[PDB]
Each structure stands twice: as structure tokens, then as C-alpha cells.
Curated annotation (Swiss-Prot):
Changing P434S: In NS1; increased phosphatase activity. It is an enzyme of class 3 (hydrolase). InterPro entries: Prot-tyrosine_phosphatase-like, PTP_cat, SH2, SH2_dom_sf, Tyr_Pase_AS, Tyr_Pase_cat, Tyr_Pase_dom, Tyr_Pase_non-rcpt_typ-6/11. This is Tyrosine-protein phosphatase non-receptor type 11. Phosphorylated upon activation of the receptor-type kinase FLT3. Phosphorylated upon activation of the receptor-type kinase PDGFRA. Phosphorylated by activated PDGFRB. Changing L224F: In NS1; increases MAPK signaling; increases protein tyrosine phosphatase activity; changed substrate selectivity for GAB1. The keyword Magnesium does not apply. The gene is PTPN11. Changing I264V: In NS1; benign. Belongs to the protein-tyrosine phosphatase family. Non-receptor class 2 subfamily.
Length: 468
């Protein structure tokens, strides 16, 4: 994911592509903050293509909608031509880069939060590599920056700290007394104690910190390019709401027509899915039935900004309907401020004794773009959903959907996973928002779409702990 440059202007991108690139050379960069630009070189000229994400997907002008920037790039490199990634040498979005950090503060972080192999890189004009080895000691290796090249005092001269770090991660430096300076894992600094969320929120709200953390998490999406073959099959193309927003094969829900654009999310489990198409309503009820799901969370309106987001897959109040071999009665509709509750009874046609109540919680006030200004409403909604799920003996995974099932769906599931830790373990527990996001993202592409949603998750968690 070296083709992503986090701090460059359009003019900087043009000079990079014109003097250091060739025709087919490309880079992606953040632009209107919240938007992205794909800068491509074609016939000695640089073209700037806008990528927009309001929280649902990455919408590329002239192209398609995607779950990640790494998925967008992979698709266009495997299918204006993107031939050559122009690699960024800036270490800002690397998990191990700490910029300004003292040798005492870095030794303090590594002593408290570190283990064998924990390393970091910090900053006159030179850098320091601080590593922990044992079960124990902390070693500091100087990194000279000579003529825009990096070295440890001998041997190879690297063009970037990333190239130096990856080389010594594969071929570790051995101290001339036996110690192998193993660079196993970057030091974990994102994990906070639940009780100190307000201190972290304040630190991340400073010049912004939330953007710096979200973008470091985004640089790890390249490790999540898992196969999505079943969703690419001819027979399954029109079962997808967005052609390239597909479920991973290793986590996809298999129906025992075995396909649905849904994935199991394991932290209480979830099924993260897209908004129904008219041709997928029957597949959706077969999923709910097979998975013994008793609660559905819908986080979109049927129609948003004049576009359909999910077809009406449930009957009108008091009506009874058949969806293939599935049968749904809408027993009762209850309305609250932020949402609607629908009591549905699901059964298999011809088999009365298969009946179960399915509670549909439909959140109706999420803004068309961005996030709600206060997380109170979402939290009250998640609280009520949790209690319904917990009250039902041996209930299957909670079904969660929006339009593509990655943005709002990913936000709701992540808040819910985090809140759950605080329910069982209490205000005296460890919470790690990006580790948790990365974990859910390995189960469905691009779960949690924007920095606004990312900030919303911290704020939601902050509010839950405060109202305790
Ligand atoms: C403020 N600067 C100067 C210091 C600083 C602070 C925090 C980080 C940091 C940010 C991260 O954003 N996602 C992950 C992540 C990715 C994959 C898996 C798990 C995780 Cl936690 C992540 C991470 O690991 N680290 C360490 C890096 C540098």
C-alpha cells in the first residue's frame, strides 16, 4: 500500500509523477477533506480522479464503488491504465513510527506495554530504532539519514525507513555477543484502559489525532485482500448490490443457490450483510432461518437521496407473506424516536413447528451523509438490541445491514463489540478500537468506512462509560 501518500498536495503528486514516474504510474492521496484523489500519469500528462466516501463505500468517478482503496487498486491493476504504483517513502502511517519521542519515554512505553520483539522508530534529522528482547532489555540503534538514504552505520543504504525496517525484520541485526535484535511486532500504544477513554479522546482530538490513527489502520488493509471468488461467479453477479463489494469466501454465509452477500462476524455473533435486492429477498429469509437469527438490525431507510438502499423485505403490519419456502407474518410495529421495532414470525411453509419470532430493529434517523452529531440515540438503540438478543435462549447471530453492509453496519457491530467488553469485564478492562476494527475487517471487507465513523465509535464508547 506504498502507493498511498498521506501528506501531499496535487502539485506535489504531479511533480512526483512527472519527474519520478512514467506512463501508467499512479498514486492515491487524501484531498475537500474526507475525499481521495487517484493521480495517474498518461501520455506525459497527470490526471486527477476524485474518490468520494460519505460512509457507504469508495465511489470512484469514471469507475465503480469499492470496499477499500487496496481493493479499488487491485481491481484496476488486474483488469486510463494503472500500471506502476509510485511508492511513498514517508513513514507517517506505519504502525512502528512515533515521530517525536524521547529515549526515556520510548524506553518507558517498551518497558510497560512491550514484550519480546516489540519495536518502534522515532526521531537532529536522524532516527532511532528502539527494540525490546527477553521475556528482558531495551536496545537503541541509531539510523543516520545521509543524502535522503537510511542506514544503521554499515552495509545497505535504504531509500526509506520502511525499506530499512522490512530488511531488518527479515534479516535481524545480531549483537556481537549473541542477542538477535528481532523486530517481531510494533509496540501497541492504541490499547487504553476503558476508564481512561476521555483522556485518549482528548489526546486524539488534538492537532487531528483521530485522522493520524485511522490512516495508520487503513495502511493495514493490504493484508486483508482475501479471496471473494464465489461472489464473482456468473450465477452470483446480480445477487450483489455493488458488483465489486463482495464477501470473503472464508467467512461468507453458505446457504444449504448457496450464495448471499453476507459474512459471519465473530468478535455473541453477527451476520454483516447488504440491503436486500428484489431478487435476494428469498435468500435473505433462508439465511435468517438457517442461522436461527432472532434479531435484525437495519441501519438505513429504504430510500435515501432518491436512491433505493434496501427493498421492503418484511410484510406490512398484520399482513402475512411468503418469500419462497419462507413465510413471514408482521405481528406488530412499535415506534420509538430514532427507530421502529417490527415483531415478525418466521416459519418454513408446510412446517408449522418451525415458527420463531424475529425482531427487526429499524434505525431511521442516521444522516444521509456522515454520522449523527450525538451518539446517545445509537447507544439506546444498541442497548435495547442487546437486551432482546440476551433474553432469547440459544438465539443465532444478530443480522446487521445498511445498503452495502460495510459502513454503518461495520460501525454498529464495532460499537456493539466494544460495549460488550465493558458489560462483562466492567469499566476496568482493556479496549483497543483499531485492533478490533482490523479483526472485523478480516471477516468482511472495509467494515468501518470513514474517519467520521471511526471518531463516532470512540465518542459512542466515551458516552457509554460516562453514563455508567
Ligand atoms: C502518535 N504517533 C506519533 C504515535 C503512534 C500511535 C499509535 C500508532 C498505532 C496506530 C494504529 O492504527 N491501527 C493500528 C493497528 C493496525 C493493525 C492491527 C492492530 C492495530 Cl492497533 C495501529 C497500531 O498498531 N499502532 C501502534 C502508531 C504510532
Amino acid at each position: 500500500r506504498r502507493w498511498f501518500h498521506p501528506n501531499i498536495t496535487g502539485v506535489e503528486a504531479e511533480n512526483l509523477l512527472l519527474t519520478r514516474g512514467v506512463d501508467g504510474s499512479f498514486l492515491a492521496r487524501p484531498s475537500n477533506p474526507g475525499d481521495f484523489t487517484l493521480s495517474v500519469r498518461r501520455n506525459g500528462a497527470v490526471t486527477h480522479i476524485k474518490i468520494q466516501n460519505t460512509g457507504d463505500y469508495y465511489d470512484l468517478y469514471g469507475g465503480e464503488k469499492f470496499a477499500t482503496l487496496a481493493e479499488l487498486v487491485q481491481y484496476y491493476m488486474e483488469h486510463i491504465e494503472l500500471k506502476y504504483p509510485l511508492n511513498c517513502a514517508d513513514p507517517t502511517s506505519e504502525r512502528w513510527f512515533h515521530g517525536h519521542l524521547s529515549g526515556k519515554e520510548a524506553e518507558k512505553l517498551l518497558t510497560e506495554k512491550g514484550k519480546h520483539g516489540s519495536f518502534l522508530v522515532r526521531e537532529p534529522g536522524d532516527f532511532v530504532l528502539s527494540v525490546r528482547t527477553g521475556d528482558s532489555k531495551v536496545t537503541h540503534v541509531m539510523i543516520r539519514c545521509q543524502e535522503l538514504k537510511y542506514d544503521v552505520g554499515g552495509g545497505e543504504r535504504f531509500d526509506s525507513l520502511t525499506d530499512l525496517v522490512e530488511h531488518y525484520k527479515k534479516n535481524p541485526m545480531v549483537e556481537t555477543l549473541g542477542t538477535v535484535l528481532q523486530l517481531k511486532q510494533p509496540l501497541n500504544t492504541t490499547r487504553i484502559n476503558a476508564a481512561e477513554i476521555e483522556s485518549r479522546v482528548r489526546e486524539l482530538s488534538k492537532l487531528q489525532g483521530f485522522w493520524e490513527e485511522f490512516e495508520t489502520l487503513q495502511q493495514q488493509e493490504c493484508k486483508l485482500l482475501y479471496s471473494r471468488k464465489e461472489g464473482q461467479r456468473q450465477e452470483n453477479k446480480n445477487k450483489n448490490r455493488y458488483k465489486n463489494i463482495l464477501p470473503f469466501d472464508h467467512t461468507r454465509v453458505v446457504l444449504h443457490s448457496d450464495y448471499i452477500n453476507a459474512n459471519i462476524i465473530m468478535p455473541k455473533s453477527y451476520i454483516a450483510t447488504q440491503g436486500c435486492l428484489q431478487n435476494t429477498v428469498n435468500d435473505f429469509w433462508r439465511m435468517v432461518f438457517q442461522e436461527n437469527s432472532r434479531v435484525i438490525v437495519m441501519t438505513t431507510k429504504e430510500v435515501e437521496r432518491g436512491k433505493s438502499k434496501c427493498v421492503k423485505y418484511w410484510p406490512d403490519e398484520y399482513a402475512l407473506k411468503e418469500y419462497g419456502v419462507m413465510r413471514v407474518r408482521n405481528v406488530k410495529e412499535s415506534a420509538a424516536h430514532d427507530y421502529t421495532l417490527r415483531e415478525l414470525k418466521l416459519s418454513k411453509v408446510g412446517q408449522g413447528n418451525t415458527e420463531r419470532t424475529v425482531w427487526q430493529y429499524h434505525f431511521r434517523t442516521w444522516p444521509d451523509h456522515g454520522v449523527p452529531s450525538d451518539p446517545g440515540g445509537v447507544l439506546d438503540f444498541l442497548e435495547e438490541v442487546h437486551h432482546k438478543q440476551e433474553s432469547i435462549m440459544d438465539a443465532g447471530p444478530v443480522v446487521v445491514h445498511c445498503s452495502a453492509g460495510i459502513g454503518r453496519t461495520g460501525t454498529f457491530i464495532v460499537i456493539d463489540i466494544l460495549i460488550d467488553i465493558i458489560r462483562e469485564k466492567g469499566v476496568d478492562c482493556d479496549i483497543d478500537v483499531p485492533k478490533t476494527i482490523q479483526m472485523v475487517r478480516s471477516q468482511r471487507s472495509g467494515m468501518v468506512q470513514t474517519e467520521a465513523q471511526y471518531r463516532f465509535i470512540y465518542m459512542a464508547v466515551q458516552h457509554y462509560i460516562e453514563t455508567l
